[PDB]
């Protein structure tokens, strides 16, 4: 067998070990929807309590993406500068892509704190336009019916992007990128799923949405600093201040 069949297996294993929520659990829980009373309870919470909760969940989500990256063949052999450039630019883009597995397009709900709720759950945060954009992005991705292996290989390429500004060893990132591109393309051909390539989000759209999301998180962190369960000092240092 080729390096490439092994690389598909190792990327998918890295994803399985770090996916955070199991797809089978997410799909089984779709009928478990917050009641009108439970939605009102969330809408009445303080902006600042909803921010603490959401910030904790998002921090956590990012940490699973860091663990995913650490398991990607060659990622740990990149210099620390380049690891941090890639994670800073890509880890929240990966969280936004990972959201589609936890999103039900039939009723426009997301799995949050054990049940599915709509964007109105988050009313107290006063972010309706941005949250609507995040839901809309998941709605767009939901139409692809991404397999678990498609998510794994696609999100590896969201991270391993030799075009990110500020890389010091661009050729080393290019080598990992080309092998992951070949892995993804080989896998789509074998599964008769090449049709998804034309349907993937424009890179500018994911970048713009991620930038808007992180900017809003930065504003909340400035107004109301959180306690972070920090595991990755070089990455923490780049995002928190």
Ligand X SMILES: C[C@H](CCCC(C)(C)O)[C@H]1CC[C@H]2[C@@H]3CC=C4C[C@@H](O)CC[C@]4(C)[C@H]3CC[C@]12C
* SS3 category, 111: strand
Q: Is residue 55 a contact residue for ligand L3E (CB under 6 A)?
A: yes
Nearest to 98 by CA among 154, 55, 136: 154
Scanning residues 208 to 227, which ones bind ligand L3E (CB under 6 A)? 214, 217-218, 221, 226
Minimum CB distance to ligand L3E, residue 233 (Å): 6
Q: Which stretch binds ligand L3E (CB under 6 A): 55-63, 75-83, 113-121, 183-191?
A: 55-63
Residue 12 binding result from ligand L3E, ligand X, none, given CB thresholds of 5 to 8 Å by partner type: none
Cβ nearer to ligand X, comparing 102 with 152: 102
DSSP state of 35: -
Phi, psi torsion values for 83, nearest 5 degrees: -55, -45
Q: Is residue 236 a contact residue for ligand L3E (CB under 6 A)?
A: yes
The continuous run of DSSP H or E covering 26 comes out as helix 23-28
Q: What are the structure tokens assigned to 200, written together?
A: 């993937």
Cβ nearer to ligand L3E, comparing 8 with 209: 209
Strand boundaries in the chain, DSSP class E: 103-104, 109-112, 115-117
Nearest to 86 by CA among 177, 7, 9: 177
Q: Is residue 240 a contact residue for ligand L3E (CB under 6 A)?
A: yes
| Contact footprint for ligand L3E (CB under 6 A) | 55, 58-59, 62-63, 87-88, 91-92, 214, 217-218, 221, 226, 228, 230-232, 235-236, 239-240
């Amino acid at each position: 067998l080729t390096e490439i069949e092994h690389l598909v297996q190792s990327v998918c294993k890295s994803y399985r070990e770090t996916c955070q929520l199991r797809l089978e659990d997410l799909l089984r829980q779709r009928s478990n929807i917050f009641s009108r009373e439970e939605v009102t309870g969330y809408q009445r919470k303080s902006m600042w309590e909803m921010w603490e909760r959401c910030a904790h969940h998002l921090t956590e989500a990012i940490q699973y993406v860091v663990e995913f990256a650490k398991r990607l063949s060659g990622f740990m052999e990149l210099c620390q500068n380049d690891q941090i450039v890639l994670l800073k630019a890509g880890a929240m883009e990966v969280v936004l892509v990972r959201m589609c597995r936890a999103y039900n397009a039939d009723n426009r709900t997301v799995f949050f704190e054990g049940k599915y709720g709509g964007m109105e759950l988050f009313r107290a945060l006063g972010c309706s336009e941005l949250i609507s954009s995040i839901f809309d992005f998941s709605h767009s991705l939901s139409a692809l019916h991404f397999s678990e292996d498609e998510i794994a290989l696609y999100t590896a390429l969201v991270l391993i992007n030799a075009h990110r500004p500020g890389l010091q060893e661009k050729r080393k990132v290019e080598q990992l990128q080309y092998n992951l591109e070949l892995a993804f393309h080989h896998h789509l051909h074998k599964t008769h799923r090449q049709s998804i390539l034309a349907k993937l989000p424009p890179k500018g759209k994911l970048r713009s949405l991620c930038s808007q999301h992180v900017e809003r998180l930065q504003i909340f962190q400035h107004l109301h600093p959180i306690v972070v369960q920090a595991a990755f000092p070089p990455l923490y240092k780049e995002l928190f201040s």
